[PDB]
Amino acid sequence: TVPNFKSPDPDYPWYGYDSYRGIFARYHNLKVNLKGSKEYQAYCFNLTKYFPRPTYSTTNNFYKKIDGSGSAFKSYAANPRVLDENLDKLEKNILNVIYNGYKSNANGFMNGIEDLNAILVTQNAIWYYSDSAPLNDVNKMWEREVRNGEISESQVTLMREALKKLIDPNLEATAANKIPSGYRLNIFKSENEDYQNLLSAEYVP
Ligand SMILES: [Zn+2]
Ligand SMILES: [Zn+2]
Ligand SMILES: [Zn+2]
């Protein structure tokens, strides 16, 4: 089942929402849809802004859909990781992260990682680029969860290795399966600028 919400502003007609219903605050599972249409997977593009509310909340988040590009990725990010002012490289970097992360998993980096953990890994790789999140201690990430029996040692080992592959600057060059001709993602610009702009996990027509 998908929600069907109509925006008060037709310029921002997409509903964005957190579909995670569980008890662990570490997890989110963001989606967008359009007046009851099939839904699409999304990610937070702004680490320092609020995540979309849970589906069916009394407060609803609406969005305008924009084609992804290096320009858009720069403009809608708070602190993007750009080398030598090269927005084409920023575009390539983000596209290759998404293509290799949840759900496309084009080179198997995600294999065996439970969906919510795979989203969490991919989300961290996106923030490495959108917010210049440092990620200098990947071998210790989620150790608190391991110690407390919340994520298995086995899942966390997979997650750490996947994250390292996703943030390698040579990902595009070394991955065997390359992004397809015409590959495109979308930015969702929040109608309420206290909430995150979103990045799709596939093309959203
Ligand atoms: Zn939350
Ligand atoms: Zn490398
Ligand atoms: Zn604005």
Numbering used by the authors: 66 to 270
Paper text:
Further, we present the identification of host fibrinogen as a covalently bound target of the streptococcal surface protein SfbI. In a thioester-dependent mechanism, SfbI reacts with one specific lysine residue in fibrinogen, forming a very stable intermolecular amide bond. Using a combination of computational, biochemical, structural and cell-based assays we reveal a novel mechanism for host adhesion mediated by a pathogen-encoded covalent interaction.
